[PDB]
Amino acid sequence: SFHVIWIASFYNHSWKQNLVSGWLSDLQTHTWDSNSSTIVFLWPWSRGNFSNEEWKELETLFRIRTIRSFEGIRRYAHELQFEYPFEIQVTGGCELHSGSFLQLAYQGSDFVSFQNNSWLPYPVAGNMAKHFCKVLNQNQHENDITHNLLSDTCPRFILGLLDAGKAHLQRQVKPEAWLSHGPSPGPGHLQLVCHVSGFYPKPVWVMWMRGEQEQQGTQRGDILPSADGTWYLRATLEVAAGEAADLSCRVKHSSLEGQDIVLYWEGSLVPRG
Amino acid sequence: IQRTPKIQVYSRHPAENGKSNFLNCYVSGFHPSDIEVDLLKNGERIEKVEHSDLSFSKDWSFYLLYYTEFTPTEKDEYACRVNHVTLSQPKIVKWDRDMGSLVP
Numbered sequence: 050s051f052h053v054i055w056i057a058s059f060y061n062h063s064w065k066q067n068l069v070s071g072w073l074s075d076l077q078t079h080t081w082d083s084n085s086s087t088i089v090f091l092w093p094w095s096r097g098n099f100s101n102e103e104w105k106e107l108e109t110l111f112r113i114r115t116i117r118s119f120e121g122i123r124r125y126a127h128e129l130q131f132e133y134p135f136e137i138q139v140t141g142g143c144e145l146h147s148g149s150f151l152q153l154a155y156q157g158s159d160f161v162s163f164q165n166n167s168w169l170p171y172p173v174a175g176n177m178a179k180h181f182c183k184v185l186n187q188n189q190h191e192n193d194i195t196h197n198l199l200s201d202t203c204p205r206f207i208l209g210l211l212d213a214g215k216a217h218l219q220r221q222v223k224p225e226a227w228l229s230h231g232p233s234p235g236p237g238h239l240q241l242v243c244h245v246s247g248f249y250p251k252p253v254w255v256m257w258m259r260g261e262q263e264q265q266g267t268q269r270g271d272i273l274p275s276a277d278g279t280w281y282l283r284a285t286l287e288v289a290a291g292e293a294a295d296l297s298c299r300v301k302h303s304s305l306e307g308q309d310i311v312l313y314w315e316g317s318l319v320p321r322g
Numbered sequence: 323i324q325r326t327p328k329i330q331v332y333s334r335h336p337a338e339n340g341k342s343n344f345l346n347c348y349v350s351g352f353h354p355s356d357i358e359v360d361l362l363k364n365g366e367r368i369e370k371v372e373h374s375d376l377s378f379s380k381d382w383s384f385y386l387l388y389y390t391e392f393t394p395t396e397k398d399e400y401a402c403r404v405n406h407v408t409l410s411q412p413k414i415v416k417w418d419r420d421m422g423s424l425v426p
């Protein structure tokens with residue numbers, strides 16, 4: 050599962066911003082340098098099976114299509130009813146062992162998408178998206194190249210890369226956990242917070258417990274990224290100030306091999322005497 | 323249309339006075355991508371703050387991770403300050419750390 054995202058911000062006809070990045074599964078592997086027009090490799094295995102000459106062509110292909118896209122947008126902006134400032138987002142990729150996609154958004158809403166061999170407008174995006182597909186489909190040879198980038202070049206990039214860097218995606222990193230008081234509780238209530246930090250991969254199990262009974266009031270937060278490549282999660286439980294006894298947090302993770310982390314609401318947390 | 327950012331603050335390790343740590347501010351679900359995020363130490367802006375490359379979710383809303391290395395003490399308060407076109411005023415979200423039991 051590899052895909053590439055574009056973030057093109059058009060503040061006016063003379064001011065632009067282009068942010069490009071490539072993602073293996075969920076690990077950013079590439080970045081575009083607007084200056085020098087170069088694909089920046091984030092890891093020694095970002096280039097994969099491909100040689101310097103093939104990357105020079107890939108940089109040139111993305112160089113030509115980017116210059117052609119930004120110029121075509123500003124040429125047809127009035128006809129397309131694109132009112133400054135606006136933002137266009139693109140995401141496209143593939144995966145096998147199969148699927149392929151390429152989607153474009155205008156002002157953060159579905160606008161057009163690529164289907165097999167041409168650009169189809171999203172019907173809700175109206176006439177301006179049909180006008181956009183008229184300009185995107187003006188050259189069928191370019192749509193054939195776009196097809197092969199998705200169906201052929203993209204799965205080939207996974208091969209020489211998802212095998213070379215396969216070890217990192219299967220790395221097992223044990224979590225750490227701790228307990229704390231939460232803010233904003235109801236009157237006469239407490240918010241018990243169980244933090245789980247530094248685990249990999251993403252799937253994780255965490256519940257407040259009363260012995261062996263799972264506490265179904267457990268509110269599991271969003272899994273948040275950490276810049277070291279691991280994940281973070283908060284699980285909160287709101288309890289009446291007296292009923293906070295015998296409570297514990299239990300964490301299950303593939304890296305622990307059944308040896309769950311169990312922390313007890315105890316000590317200065319209660320607090321004891 | 324526009325979407326207001328969600329702001330979530332967390333430390334990488336449990337808070338321990340005198341031990342280096344990492345403070346994180348994860349901002350997500352906003353549109354457009356133009357946003358100003360600051361990490362605050364006792365109300366003043368922290369220089370040398372890293373942030374991840376801009377990205378977006380399936381619904382096209384943007385997200386970012388701001389982080390810096392830090393060492394908490396007994397007195398320091400930490401927070402995340404975010405300004406966005408959807409906000410009337412900059413929203414400040416505190417880092418919720420537990421300094422232990424109060425009464426000695």
Ligand SMILES: CCCCCCCC/C=C\CCCCCCCC(=O)N[C@@H](COP(=O)(O)OCC[N+](C)(C)C)[C@@H](O)/C=C/CCCCCCCCCCCCC
Nearest residue numbers: 055057070071079114117118121122141184191198203206
């Ligand atoms: C950095 C990491 C790189 C790592 C890669 C290494 C492994 C590669 C493996 C898989 C990658 C494959 C998956 C991605 C497939 C990509 C599909 C693709 O190339 N799309 C192109 C098609 O443009 P055309 O050449 O057809 O038409 C040009 C204009 N005509 C009408 C004027 C002539 C276009 O949409 C995007 C251009 C770049 C975006 C920048 C601009 C933002 C606005 C974009 C739209 C503006 C439209 C303007 C219309 C006037």
Ligand SMILES: *[C@@H]1O[C@H](CO)[C@@H](O)[C@H](O)[C@H]1NC(C)=O
Nearest residue numbers: 097098099208209210212213
């Ligand atoms: C890279 O491609 C070559 C063929 O061009 C092949 O010999 C090799 O096994 C591939 N993978 C590597 C070198 O990791």
